[PDB]
């Protein structure tokens, strides 16, 4: 297994836009239409990313293209961050996928907010990080996903996804 299959399991696939638990418009495989509060700004944004004047619905191909774009953006956002990069550099391949998964869901700035947890990961304090990440707004709003991602950081295995 790799990061793309792990995220496909966590993001799912939808060909028309939908609102998440916080009300953010998403489409495809976890693709955020926009950060803006404005709803009108969301469709405009999508069309620019899709590269066509959409009518609301996209194709599986456009979704997978967006997915490739977004997984790449997540990884780069980690490396461009002073708080995330060092953590990433210290982790094994499986756990790096877990970190990317979080950034893909919450964005670089949002993940950089897990100060104590990040530092425990960098120190290889698996169980400590696991208990602390479970005590968060992220876990409360998306507990099934948080649990799987946390199980991954805890064990260093893909068991929560197979
Ligand atoms: Cl879905
Ligand atoms: Cl969930």
UniProtKB/Swiss-Prot annotation:
Transmembrane segments: none annotated. Changing residue 11 to Q: Complete loss of activity. Optimum pH is 7.3. Changing residue 117 to F: 10-fold decrease in enzymatic activity. Gene3D superfamilies: 1.10.530.40. GO terms for molecular function: lysozyme activity. The active site is at 11 (proton donor/acceptor). Its main location: host cell. Pfam families: Phage_lysozyme (PF00959). CDD domains: T4-like_lys. Changing residue 132 to I: 5-fold decrease in enzymatic activity. The keyword Hydrolase applies. One of its GO terms (biological process) is peptidoglycan catabolic process. Keywords: Antimicrobial, Bacteriolytic enzyme, Cytolysis, Glycosidase, Host cell lysis by virus, Host cytoplasm, Hydrolase, Viral release from host cell. It comes from the Viruses. The keyword Acyltransferase does not apply. Endolysin with lysozyme activity that degrades host peptidoglycans and participates with the holin and spanin proteins in the sequential events which lead to the programmed host cell lysis releasing the mature viral particles. Once the holin has permeabilized the host cell membrane, the endolysin can reach the periplasm and break down the peptidoglycan layer. This is Endolysin. It comes from Enterobacteria phage T4 (Bacteriophage T4).
């Amino acid at each position: 297994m790799n990061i793309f299959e792990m995220l496909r399991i966590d993001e799912g696939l939808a060909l028309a836009a939908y609102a998440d638990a916080a009300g953010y418009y998403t489409i495809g495989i976890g693709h955020l239409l926009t950060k803006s509060p404005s709803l009108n700004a969301a469709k405009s944004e999508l069309d620019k990313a899709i590269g066509r004047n959409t009518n609301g619905v996209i194709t599986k191909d456009e979704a997978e293209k967006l997915f490739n774009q977004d997984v790449d953006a997540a990884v780069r956002g980690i490396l461009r961050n002073a708080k995330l990069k060092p953590v990433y550099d210290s982790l094994d391949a499986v756990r790096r996928a877990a970190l990317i998964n979080m950034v893909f869901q919450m964005g670089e700035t949002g993940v950089a907010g897990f100060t104590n947890s990040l530092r425990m990961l960098q120190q290889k304090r698996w169980d400590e990080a696991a208990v602390n990440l479970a005590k968060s707004r992220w876990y409360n709003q998306t507990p099934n996903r948080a649990k799987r991602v946390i199980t991954t950081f805890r064990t260093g295995t893909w068991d929560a996804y197979k």
